[PDB]
Amino acid sequence: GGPSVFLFPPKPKDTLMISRTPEVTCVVVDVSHEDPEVKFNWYVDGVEVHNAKTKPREEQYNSTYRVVSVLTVLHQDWLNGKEYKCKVSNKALPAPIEKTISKAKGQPREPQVYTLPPSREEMTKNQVNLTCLVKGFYPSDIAVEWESNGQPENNYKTTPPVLDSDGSFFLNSTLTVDKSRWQQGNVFSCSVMHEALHNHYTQKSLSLS
Ligand SMILES: *[C@@H]1O[C@H](CO)[C@@H](O[C@@H]2O[C@H](CO)[C@@H](O[C@@H]3O[C@H](CO[C@H]4O[C@H](CO)[C@@H](O)[C@H](O)[C@@H]4O[C@@H]4O[C@H](CO)[C@@H](O)[C@H](O)[C@H]4NC(C)=O)[C@@H](O)[C@H](O[C@H]4O[C@H](CO)[C@@H](O)[C@H](O)[C@@H]4O[C@@H]4O[C@H](CO)[C@@H](O)[C@H](O)[C@H]4NC(C)=O)[C@@H]3O)[C@H](O)[C@H]2NC(C)=O)[C@H](O)[C@H]1NC(C)=O
Numbered sequence: 001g002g003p004s005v006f007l008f009p010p011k012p013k014d015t016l017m018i019s020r021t022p023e024v025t026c027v028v029v030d031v032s033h034e035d036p037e038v039k040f041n042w043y044v045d046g047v048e049v050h051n052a053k054t055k056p057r058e059e060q061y062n063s064t065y066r067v068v069s070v071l072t073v074l075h076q077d078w079l080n081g082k083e084y085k086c087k088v089s090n091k092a093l094p095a096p097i098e099k100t101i102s103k104a105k106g107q108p109r110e111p112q113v114y115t116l117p118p119s120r121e122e123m124t125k126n127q128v129n130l131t132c133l134v135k136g137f138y139p140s141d142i143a144v145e146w147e148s149n150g151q152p153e154n155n156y157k158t159t160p161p162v163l164d165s166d167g168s169f170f171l172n173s174t175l176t177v178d179k180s181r182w183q184q185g186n187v188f189s190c191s192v193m194h195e196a197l198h199n200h201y202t203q204k205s206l207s208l209s
């Protein structure tokens with residue numbers, strides 16, 4: 001004795017993109033070789049659901065199994081604050097273990113998005129940094145990408161959301177492009193996906209005129 005349960009929320013980009021699959025993951029550790037069977041029961045706002053997929057158990061190096069149940073959440077249900085409950089049953093458990101999860105509960109706040117052209121010190125060089133400042137958003141769940149002429153620009157680094165003095169979040173996204181591309185006057189756009197924006201999406205464009 002005995003097993004432990006950990007419940008994980010979906011990835012932010014999965015929650016914000018219609019083509020992606022947002023999943024809540026119920027992980028059971030310390031499952032015995034003697035009694036390796038785990039019964040998973042799932043509830044959405046107290047209502048039982050039967051659409052979760054279990055994965056084949058894995059032997060840990062500490063000679064125990066790690067057993068996982070993955071529940072697909074509806075994009076709208078997750079955003080509307082529905083509660084996801086995982087109930088775990090196992091013979092080595094006198095009473096089942098339950099864990100509940102839902103989206104962060106504070107008041108949603110819309111991100112403010114600003115673009116920063118390369119600084120004269122930054123601009124003289126071979127490759128230039130284009131910056132997208134995203135601040136004042138809540139919850140921290142967000143997705144920031146770059147684009148030009150309808151195609152993704154992949155040479156970017158986005159900082160993790162940082163908790164600010166007023167309890168909201170902020171981050172920077174920096175795209176590195178060849179100076180020649182920026183200098184030419186090509187339009188680079190910063191894409192921001194967040195629940196509180198109108199239509200959960202905004203974009204800010206940056207170009208040298
Ligand atoms: C046998 O060996 C096993 C494998 O090594 C080992 O399993 C490990 O067991 C420990 C505890 O014994 C368990 O620890 C918990 O880990 C939580 C994070 O797990 C994440 O992230 C880690 C690394 O950061 C990864 O290794 C995990 O795979 C898992 O990854 C996430 O997985 C999901 C689904 O797969 C993905 O969607 C995510 O992308 C992914 N993230 C990453 C970064 O990869 C960690 O959060 C836990 O801390 C919290 O719970 C503790 C419980 O004791 C608290 O003490 C601690 O304070 C934290 O509290 C929680 O946090 C908040 C505070 O209230 C609230 O959210 C919660 O209410 C609260 N919970 C409470 C109080 O219960 C925690 O340390 C490891 O995850 C696990 N590793 C794996 C791989 O399974 C076994 O223990 C070994 N057996 C032994 C030693 O006997």
Ligand SMILES: *[C@@H]1O[C@H](CO)[C@@H](O)[C@H](O)[C@H]1NC(C)=O
Pocket residue numbers: 125127128129157174176
């Ligand atoms: C651009 O900014 C990134 C991230 O802040 C940094 O690592 C890099 O060295 C800067 N300059 C260029 C030319 O990318």
